[PDB]
Amino acid sequence: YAQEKQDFVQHFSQIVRVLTEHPEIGDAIARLKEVLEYNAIGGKYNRGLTVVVAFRELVEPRKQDADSLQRAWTVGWCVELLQAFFLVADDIMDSSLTRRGQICWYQKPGVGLDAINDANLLEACIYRLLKLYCREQPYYLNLIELFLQSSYQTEIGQTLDLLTAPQNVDLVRFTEKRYKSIVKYKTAFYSFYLPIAAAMYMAGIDGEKEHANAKKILLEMGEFFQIQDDYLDLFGDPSVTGKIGTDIQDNKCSWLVVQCLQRATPEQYQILKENYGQKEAEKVARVKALYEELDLPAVFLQYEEDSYSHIMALIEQYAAPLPPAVFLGLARKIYK
Amino acid sequence: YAQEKQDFVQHFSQIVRVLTEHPEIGDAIARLKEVLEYNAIGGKYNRGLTVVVAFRELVEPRKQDADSLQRAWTVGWCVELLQAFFLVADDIMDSSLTRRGQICWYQKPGVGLDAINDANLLEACIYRLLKLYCREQPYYLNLIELFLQSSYQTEIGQTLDLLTAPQNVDLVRFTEKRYKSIVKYKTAFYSFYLPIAAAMYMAGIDGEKEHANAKKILLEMGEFFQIQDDYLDLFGDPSVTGKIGTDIQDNKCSWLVVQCLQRATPEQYQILKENYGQKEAEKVARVKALYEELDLPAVFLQYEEDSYSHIMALIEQYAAPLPPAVFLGLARKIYK
Ligand SMILES: Cc1ccc(-c2cc3c(N[C@@H](c4ccc5c(c4)CCO5)P(=O)(O)O)ncnc3s2)cc1
Ligand SMILES: Cc1ccc(-c2cc3c(N[C@@H](c4ccc5c(c4)CCO5)P(=O)(O)O)ncnc3s2)cc1
Ligand SMILES: [Cl-]
Ligand SMILES: [Cl-]
Ligand SMILES: [Cl-]
Ligand SMILES: [Cl-]
């Protein structure tokens, strides 16, 4: 990833040139440029890069001409745009202030709820690019369907989340069956399955069974990834993470609170109930302490270990005939 | 349309049954059901019905088996869902209160900005249905691309609109070149081109030139349709329209204000400037009077006539080899 990151970001400028070239609509296109530059840039690009890297592990290097690669870059960027769409819109729904410590787009002066359109444009740019760069490829329809299905799964996950945590404190809502379901639909499918699957299609690997196999490994990785973000949000060194966590404040249906609830004597249940999600820090400090007293960081470390054996068993069993390195590169990024 | 309206609405119940049938996500699916029922029902269904009617004018009746028709119904409903998506989201952006005199969805208790997701789900349901009912048809990809392109054009139109009227009163913004551009992208492509084009594809009529021809007629119809809504908003008998108009109050870039501005001596320009878009009625009453004094209803009636010759010339010239009745049925609905 480290090398390839550079040429991935050089390509953006071109993604944009193309998306911004009927002159009556110039102003709108100017706006689109801003929206793209503000919202698609500034993350770590892990998802989009995954498309590119996996495309290289999957194609015999004699089928990686400069146009094959230009498409891999572009489709990686399609993943990033999809993400950008979700985030811009999620920030609005959450009433968030910052994203990656920068002002959320909808919070910029004179944008506001216009960001809903802007988010929709981001989504749309995915399908323009696919047409621009892949309309003639045999995997074209495969990729349209995959991006569409990934949007649907994500949106559904979002609904499930929204129902489950209404900003209305209800911890009967916060069960494990349900936590898992949210992670899977809202983040894992697009974060993990999507980018690999896209590379699979670009490589001619379109079998339903192959995709199902890759899916079984990749959704389980995504479940751990998110559980680890939940853990880190509260317990990560915040300069090593970058994030300074607001989960508890926010009534989030976090892995921490789920385990906590399986592990509460009633005295502990109507304490947690008197504390999950106030601005004031001593009520949030108090929760961190209930978690600490229940050795939740230990439950996690136990979880991280088991999860790691499980992912390697899954890779042993279901990678074939993809090179296991497709999966292992990702495992290394996440269990780091 | 009058007969066919009935079976068009009987089909909805089935669109829904299908979209609502992995049980961990039941709650979200319940929500989706509500969203669909609230937002897809209650309009006049003109756009979706246009798909169905045109499909019948375009297919030899021996190729209208019960499954061909079930698809026409479904694709008509796809148009309505697309519209529903735009409206739910537009209401949020506008801060509107009611839609068709019923509470806008985002204004319902406990929905709020969650409606952004809800709107996204509506969009997504289009592509699920297309897959469910058309994946095996030779026009499948054609329809995906058309719905996607129609979304993009609409969203772009919305951007252009948003730039042009920022709720910030600026009438230098409100030019005719620009009014036309907004109408075309924001409403005409999806309202007029989309439904016919969809029927064309379903019927094997996929030539770029045929579509371009149909487009030239249909975008010009859409331009008149919207100009007429602008006129009616202020001058329609409000029980015959149903609507009681808020355009002037809203700084809308309306046809009325555009013509008005071409037809203003400076004394009239810095009057209009002191009045376009206040809550108070005497400032809105005053505008209606400036419009009246400039014989704008007459400019309109002159416009409606000319526009009608023009549409029939266009139909004469560009309908072939579609039956002109495809276009004429629509002209009759709109010049009524
Ligand atoms: C398919 C796939 C998905 C995710 C990742 C990784 C994300 C990530 C990571 N991301 C974190 C992160 C992402 C973007 C970002 C920051 C942290 C701060 C600046 O912007 P997170 O998404 O958990 O808040 N940090 C350290 N290592 C990794 S590995 C790798 C592969
Ligand atoms: C492709 C096509 C597009 C639009 C139409 C027509 C819409 C319409 C119409 N619609 C008006 C209307 C639509 C829905 C609605 C109301 C009025 C009140 C109840 O819900 P509008 O959309 O201008 O506010 N009213 C009377 N005749 C017609 S013909 C016909 C065909
Ligand atoms: Cl990332
Ligand atoms: Cl090539
Ligand atoms: Cl209608
Ligand atoms: Cl059939």
- Give the C-alpha separation, A125 to A63, whole Å: 27
Residue A49 Cα to ligand 1 midpoint, Å, equals 12
CA–CA separation, B217 and A74 (whole Å): 36
Torsion of CA B199, B200, B204, B208, to 10 degrees: -150
Q: Is B73 exposed, middle or buried (0-12, 13-18, 19+ CB in 10 A)?
A: buried
Ligand 1 atom closest to Cα of A195?
A: 1
Q: Please, which residues have CB within 8 angstroms of residue A260's CB and are 6 or more apart in sequence?
A: A272, A290, A291, A294, A296
Residue nearest (by alpha carbon) to ligand 1 atom 23? A229
Q: Please state, in angstroms and rounded to a whole number, the distance separating the CA atoms of residues B259 and B296.
A: 8
Residue with tokens 């059901």: B33
Distance A45 CA to ligand 1 centre (A): 8
Residue B108: its chain A contacts at CB < 8 A?
none
Take residue A130 and report the two structure tokens written for it: 């696919």
Resolution (A): 2.4
Per DSSP, the three-state class of A333 is helix
Cα separation, A116 vs B160, whole angstroms: 14
Q: Which tokens belong to B93? A: 């952006």
What is the B134 CA–ligand 6 centroid distance (Å)?
Answer: 10
Into how many domains does chain A fold?
Answer: 1
Q: Are A45 and A6 in contact (CB under 8 A)?
A: no
**Closest residue by CA, ligand 2 atom 15:** B43
Q: Which residue has the tokens 């039956």?
A: B323
At residue A99, φ and ψ (nearest 5 deg) are -130, 115
Is residue A254 within 8 Å of A172, Cβ to Cβ?
no
Cis? peptide before A266, omega within 30° of 0: no
Cα separation, B74 vs A176, whole angstroms: 38
Q: What residues in B contact A157, CB-CB < 8 Å? A: 28
Query: Which candidate, A329, A25, A179, A66, places its Cα nearest to that of B154?
Result: A25
* Residue B316, Cβ density class (10 Å: 0-12 exposed, 13-18 middle, ≥19 buried): exposed
* Cβ(A99)–Cβ(A226) below 8 Å: no
DSSP secondary structure string, A118-141?
Answer: HHHHHHHHHHHHHHHHHTTSTTHH
- Whether the CB-CB separation of B144 and B179 falls below 8 Å is answered with no
Closest to B138 (Cα-Cα) out of B204, B74, B39: B204
CB distance B10 to B69 below 8 Å: no
Catalytic residue, candidates A118, A229, A233, A247:
A229
> Is residue B306 part of an annotated ligand binding site?
no
Q: d(Cα A108, Cα A28) in Å, to the nearest integer?
A: 18
Find the closest chain A residue to B180 by CA distance.
A24
**Contact across the interface for B92 and A110, Cβ inside 8 Å:** no
B44 lines ligand 2 (CB under 6 A): yes
Structure tokens at A253: 């249906």
- B315 near B324, Cβ under 8 Å? yes
Asked if residue A321 has a cis previous peptide bond (ω within 30° of 0), the answer is yes
B98: phi then psi, degrees, rounded to nearest 5? -125, 155
In the annotation, is B44 catalytic? yes
Catalytic residue among A8, A55, A99, A174: A99
Are the CB atoms for A280 and A196 separated by under 8 Å? no
Cross-chain Cβ contact A148/B127 below 8 Å: yes
Technique used by the depositors: X-ray
CATH number of the domain that A54 lies in? 1.10.600.10
Best B91, B148, B172 residue to mutate vs chain A (most A CBs within 10 Å): B148
- Cα→Cα distances B143→A305, B52, B72, B326, Å: 48, 15, 12, 19
- Å between B35 CA and nearest CA of chain A: 11
Which residue(s) pair with A98 in the sheet? Answer: A103
How far is it, in rounded angstroms, from Cα B51 to Cα B169? Answer: 39
Half-sphere exposure of A171 (CA within 13 A, CB side): 23
> Measuring CA to CA, which residue among B123, B80, B188, B116 is closest to residue A119?
B116
In 3-state terms, what secondary structure has residue B243?
A: coil
Cα separation values, A17 from A33, A34, A105, A129, Å: 9, 12, 21, 11
Of B84, B106, B159, B86, which Cα lies nearest the Cα of A121? B159
Torsion of CA B256, B257, B260, B261, to 10 degrees: -150
Distance B184 CA to ligand 2 centre (A): 17
Cα dihedral across residues A297, A298, A303, A305: positive or negative = positive
Query: Helix, strand or coil for residue B44?
Result: coil
CA distance B35 to B31: 6
Residue (of A122, A144, A146) closest to A131 by Cα position: A144
User: How many beta-carbon pairs under 8 angstroms link A with B?
Assistant: 115
Euclidean distance between CA atoms A201 and A141, whole angstroms: 10
Q: Please give the angle made by the CA atoms of B156, B160 and B165, to the nearest 5 degrees.
A: 145
And the tokens for B4?
């066919």
Q: Both tokens of residue B94?
A: 């506008």
Q: Which domain holds residue B252?
A: 1-336
Q: Tell me if residue B161 is catalytic.
A: yes
Q: Alpha-carbon distance B142 to B137, whole Å?
A: 10
- Cβ within 8 Å, pair B121-A160: no
Contact A63, A71 (CB under 8 A): no
Q: Is residue B293 within 8 Å of residue B285, measured between CB atoms?
A: no
State how far the Cα of B301 lies from the Cα of B299, in Å rounded to an integer.
Answer: 6
Cα A334 to the chain's mean position, in Å? 13
Considering CB atoms only, which of A120, A157, A162 is closest to B155?
A120
Q: Which residue's structure tokens are 């819109």? A: A89
B110: left (phi over 0), alpha (psi -120 to 50) or beta: left
CA dihedral B278, B282, B288, B292 (to 10 degrees): -150
- CA nearest neighbour of B331 among B308, B313, B314: B308
